[PDB]
Design a protein around this nucleic acid. Sequence first.
DNA 1: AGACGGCTGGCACGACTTTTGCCAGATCAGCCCTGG
Length: 258
Amino acid sequence: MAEYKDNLLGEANSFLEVLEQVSHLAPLDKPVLIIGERGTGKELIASRLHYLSSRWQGPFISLNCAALNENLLDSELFGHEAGAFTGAQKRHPGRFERADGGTLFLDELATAPMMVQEKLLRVIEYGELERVGGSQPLQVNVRLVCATNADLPAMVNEGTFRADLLDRLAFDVVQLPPLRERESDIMLMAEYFAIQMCREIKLPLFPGFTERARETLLNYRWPGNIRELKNVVERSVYRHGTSDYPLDDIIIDPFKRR
DNA sequence: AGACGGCTGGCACGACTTTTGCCAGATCAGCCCTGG
Ligand SMILES: Nc1ncnc2c1ncn2[C@@H]1O[C@H](COP(=O)(O)OP(=O)(O)O)[C@@H](O)[C@H]1O
């Protein structure tokens, strides 16, 4: 509900439309898909969805679907009421349940193994997750929001990703425009990144931007995303020096031998 | 008198019991120090 303090810096007149779209999704409990490319700041949008929802007071755990162990999947997702030691007074909590009352964020959906895919598909459709041991089903209420950069229709075509959980979890998608599509906010991000760098390196003052530098970073196909642009500025501002002259040289990729 | 049947015990082979040998840590509550 309360707008958390985050950097979205939106002026592209397309990012504003995406922001309105996600704001419309803020109250609803329906599953949400975030579609983007490398970088693109999808995590900020996901945090925006969770943190402007009715259940925002709830927790906001975010699991890395690539990071879950294969064998330990069941206990990791559910937990075991039995303690680690004899006569234990408590148990470890699984990924699920630890999310109840709030949203669960999923990332790298495409690279999730088939074991994760099939185990996660069963739990969402019905809930009633049961920890290993005992016969007591616990009912859960968790919002799911996920972000990915690969092409899950192609993943379905190859069959390396099950289409059923996709269909269940594809109520609505939000499209994120690439930085090259935005092509208007580059000045403001460049400047904000440079100002942050000024304090990080403890440089005294920002020198300024030359027209040649503006032309070169503007006239770029930008396969890299906002973070690639961020790193670019980071490299050039440091290589420039102590701001006695305006910033003049931009190195697009630090790989050319020279 | 010799062979046949019978009785008993040692040894062996699964199947199941029972005997010992493991060696802390995290977590919570009250008191003391310190900031408002
Ligand atoms: N609007 C924005 N404001 C501030 N930073 C941004 C914005 N968009 C992108 N970024 C930067 O780009 C990065 C994208 O990270 P992330 O969303 O994790 O990429 P991916 O979704 O591919 O994993 C973030 O670390 C963030 O610092």
